[PDB]
């Protein structure tokens, strides 16, 4: 969707990452961007 494409652009800006990576982090976090970015910056340990 247009809206999800906008989320991917925003995620990738913050993470300075590839669009494909952004999309998968988003999708795996129910398309919830702040949650997805928290996951990105603090992955499982």
């Amino acid at each position: 969707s247009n809206a999800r494409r906008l989320l991917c652009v925003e995620f990738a800006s913050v993470a300075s990452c590839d669009a494909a990576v952004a999309q998968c982090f988003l999708a795996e976090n129910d398309w919830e961007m702040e949650r997805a970015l928290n996951s990105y910056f603090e992955p499982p340990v």
């Binding site: 925003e10 800006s13 913050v14 993470a15 300075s16 990452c17 961007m33 702040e34 949650r35 970015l37 928290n38 910056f41």
Partner: protein, 76 residues
């Protein structure tokens, strides 16, 4: 010098800092401006989360840089 902090809730925060400011110092300035507790703040520059104890100079953050602010979430 000036740096900008972009939040995910639609604000750009305009800070005054020095290269020698620590990341904690920057988070305190954000708390001053927006009331966001430092413990909630993840400050990001050039795709990397900035660590307490380092300075802006350690990360080569120069004048007019934009940082991003991601907040830790509760309840999920």
């Amino acid at each position: 010098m000036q740096i900008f902090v972009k939040t995910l809730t639609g604000k750009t925060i305009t800070l005054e800092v020095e290269p020698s400011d620590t990341i904690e110092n920057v988070k305190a300035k954000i708390q001053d401006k927006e009331g966001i507790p430092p413990d909630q703040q993840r400050l990001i520059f050039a795709g990397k989360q900035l660590e307490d104890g380092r300075t802006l100079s350690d990360y080569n953050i120069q004048k007019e840089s934009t940082l991003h602010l991601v907040l830790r979430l509760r309840g999920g």
